[PDB]
Each structure stands twice: as C-alpha cells, then as structure tokens.
Design a protein around this ligand. Sequence first.
Ligand SMILES: [Zn+2]
Ligand SMILES: [Zn+2]
Ligand SMILES: [Zn+2]
Lengths: 46, 103, 65, 266, 114
Amino acid sequence: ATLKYICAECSSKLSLSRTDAVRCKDCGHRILLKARTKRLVQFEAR
Amino acid sequence: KPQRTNTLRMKHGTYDKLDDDGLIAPGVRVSGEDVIIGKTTPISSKRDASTPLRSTENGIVDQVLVTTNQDGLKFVKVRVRTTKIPQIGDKFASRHGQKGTIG
Amino acid sequence: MIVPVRCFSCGKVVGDKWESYLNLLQEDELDEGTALSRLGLKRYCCRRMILTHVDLIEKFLRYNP
Amino acid sequence: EEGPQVKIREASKDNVDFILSNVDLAMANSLRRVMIAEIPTLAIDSVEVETNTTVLADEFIAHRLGLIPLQSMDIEQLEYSRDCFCEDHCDKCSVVLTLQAFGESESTTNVYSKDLVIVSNLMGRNIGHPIIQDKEGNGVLICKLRKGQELKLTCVAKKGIAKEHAKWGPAAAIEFEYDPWNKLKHTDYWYEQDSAKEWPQSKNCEYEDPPNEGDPFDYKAQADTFYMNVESVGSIPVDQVVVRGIDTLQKKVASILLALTQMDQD
Amino acid sequence: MNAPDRFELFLLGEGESKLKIDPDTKAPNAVVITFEKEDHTLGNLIRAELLNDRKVLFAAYKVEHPFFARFKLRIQTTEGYDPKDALKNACNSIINKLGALKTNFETEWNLQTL
Ligand SMILES: [Zn+2]
Ligand SMILES: [Zn+2]
Ligand SMILES: [Zn+2]
C-alpha cells in the first residue's frame, strides 16, 4: 500500500514525515534507502 | 521542493524531477544540470543552495540515502548511475605503460 | 558480473553456455580447454569470453538487499 | 545456372560452410558484408523496468535483453517501427515480451530468455520467440535472483539491422577466404626462414590444386572461388541468412536502379 | 551526445537523395555520383561490375570519411556511352548475378541434409 522509504538493513518499508528523525521499526538503522519510483523508467536496449 | 518566493535564487536545471521531499527517488533519469538534492536556506525566505547534477554528466538515480550524523545533522547521499560506452576519445591502456585513445 | 550474452568480437550467443560450462567443469571433471571446445566455442574470440569471465554476481547475491 | 555458383560443404541449423565460385571478390565480399551488416532481424530494443531488486542495474539488464536473439523467420512480415504508421509500437511493427521473475527459492533463482513471454498478438508470424538453442530449454542467462529479489520487465522487440546495433545481427562469425594456395600472390608471406614451412596450410588447401613450381605467375588469374561459412546466431535459420544476404543486396541495387529511374520525371 | 544516431547510416534523413549525379568536369564522358547512406558494401560492388563493362574507360569509388555514410563514384565511359546507362547496366548486371546466386544457393541448400 505505497512506500516512500525502504530502510537500509531490514528492508522494512517504512515511510515517515518530518520531525520523525531518521529511524526504522525495531532496527533503528539511522540510514533508510529512498525506495524506487513508479514512474516506469524506459530503456534503450542498446 | 522549492518553487520561488522572495529570493527566487535557484539554478537553471529543472526541479521537475525532485520529489516533494526534495530528493529524486531511485530510477529517475537525470541529465542536463538537473537538480538532485533540492535544498533551501532562509538567510539573515528561500535561498536555494542545492546540488545539481554535474554539467557534462547525465545518468539515472541508483540510490538516494538519508542519514543522521553524530551532531545529528540530516544527511543525504545520492548515487547517480551512468553506463559509459567506449566512444571516440576514451582512453585504453594495455598493461605495459602505453595508453591510447579510441580514434 | 554475469556471462555476457554474446561473445564481444563476433556475437556467438555465449550467455546461454555458462552453467553448462560450469558443469562441463565440476560434474564432468573436465578442463576448460576441452570443455570450451565442447560448448562449440571454437574461435579464441568466443573462448576468451567464457574462459576469461568472472561471475561476480554469485558474490553479489550474497549481500542481503 | 551461369554466373555465381554455391557449393555447400556442411549445412547445419547453425552453419552453412559453403564455397562461392565464379564471382568477383567484390560481390563475395559485398554479400559477406550484408550478412554481418544488413540482414533485418527482430530484437528487444526497449525495456520498461517495472521492478528490479536484482543485483544488476536496469540498463545492464536492458542491454543483455537486447542481446537475446529472437525469432526472425517472418521478419519481412514486420515493419520497422519508423515506417509503421502507428505511434511508437503496435503489433504491426513490434513484438512485446515480458520478464517476470521472483527469487522464490532460497537457492539462486536463475532467469532466462525462456522466462520471456510474448504479450502481444503475433498474428501467426513466427517472430519474437526467444531463441533457445541450449540443451535444457533455458536459452540466454539474463539475470540471477536471490530469494526476495524481483525482476519485472516489458521488452519490445523491434525490427533492426546489425548496422544500427550489432544486436540485430543474424550472423555470428562469417569465415571467408580465397586463394588458399597463395597463387594470386595476393599476400607476401612473412617468415623467419621458410614461407612454406612456417605458415600452417588453410582449411581450403585441400579443395584446390597446389601450384607447380615451374610455372609463370598467372597474372591474368583473378580472384574467384571464395570459401565462406556463415554461422547463425539463431534469430534466423542459417540458410536464410545467406539468402537474405543475397536478397538484401539485391534490394539495394534495386533501390538504386529505381533512383536512376525516378531521377527523371518530376 | 555528439554520436550521430546510428540509423543515419542506412536511412536517408531529409533533403538527401540516394544519388547525386555530377558531371565530372576534368574529363569527357565522365560522371561523379554520390550515393548517400551507402558504403563499401555497394561501392566496391558497383565499381568492380562497372569495371568489367568494356565501354567503361574509368570506374572508381571512394568513401572520403569513415564518419559519414555516403560515397562518391566516378565512371568515365566511351564517347556516346552514357555513364547512367553504364550504371543501370552494371546495376542490372549485379541483380542478375545475385539472382543466379540466390537460385544456385536455395537449390544447393535443399540438396543438403541438416
Ligand atoms: Zn530497520
Ligand atoms: Zn567470438
Ligand atoms: Zn506500429
């Protein structure tokens, strides 16, 4: 049901706003990856 | 995302690519001088200080990473991926101290 | 990373012959020289493809995400 | 049949090792070029990457996809996107493949052209089927997934010439030789002591008479008899490479004769 | 970025013809033709056919730069022999030679088992 930020280590799809600091659920991994886009990247197969 | 208010101090690269958290999310193709880390600063309302993509460069975003320092500062790290295809000019060396370009 | 699909030089589909080569090696205890000739790779241009190849992916699929 | 004359040595689904005879080197080459160059063919040329948690990057993947040979038997029955009056791609000019794969097992999920699925109506023309030549139905090894890594792709195979990108090339190698016995003296054999004793004899020395040492250099003897050998990549049956080679060359000159014609009028 | 789209090699972009015909000035009964989006494939072919033809005094072709897909072709034909007709003629001469090969091949291909 939508994801804004994955988290670095547990891969647990977080998604938090401002003043949430930078942590994850159980794995307070202060890192967090930014998860992809849905805007479908197209590619040249060349 | 900055969209100009009272200083308008921004760069020619398009912000059309930054999300509403001011960060391109992975996958998004970025080129020209496209803005990557859309940042803003009130100085003594919106003085844009932001990292646009390097001029000559153009890629696709590989990973945006948001962190915390020891002073707790918010960190962002954008990896921008580009596939580089041997062209004319690219430099190639055998293993005996002779380089040479593709003519 | 993984097997190039085609031998650079000429374009033999080489990337359909990597597991089979790894087999020709491990399960059939053959040597690369003999093994590569069996996969049909006859011109060194296509041999160097498989024989030179480093399958770093099997090390990339070892990290978690 | 008077003129150029083929004389096949081997024939397989992969090879056509033949002997062109009674032709100008020019032509024998010209065809050799056409085969490497300009036989039209179908090949994934656009990838839309839906999900890819795989270890490889999209364009990496995308690249290889394009390199997986596809069925091109009925490629004339397909138009180059660029001429097809549609808008982008449609079944008239384009086959549309899919790759969906999830690392399901805790073992390493391999991914293959086999896992490519045509999602467009082919309208009966043999086209765009991932060519599988391997002995376990897998075909080209596209990617490797760990348990929990997904790959969702939409490819689009379009009609192209190897000249546009060597991915559309139906030929693999194209062996090619003439004058196995260096009788036209077309080469000056480099040597430390003995021209003859150092250079290994060709395949095709067997198919031709060794010159007599007493003879004068045959000055008038032009190059005919060219021992070729077309290897196919799979996208088109070898026999057909050689044909469309001779065919597409025929079309070219034809494209010119029509220009010398339609050069007049208005 | 500078890299010209690879199609530009076999595909005519706008305003370009296949053939530009120029009347060689330097000599009588000679012509220079510029094929656009062709290369040696054709050049060396047409030339060495053009060259067989006996009422052709001169045939040569050159691709002046590897970057561009085009080549020039010069044919000097005898007085009263039109080079365009020599081309036409050497062109036909090819089409017929390839027909033969196409045949001969498909023929000798069928006799093969595998
Ligand atoms: Zn976590
Ligand atoms: Zn090769
Ligand atoms: Zn279409």
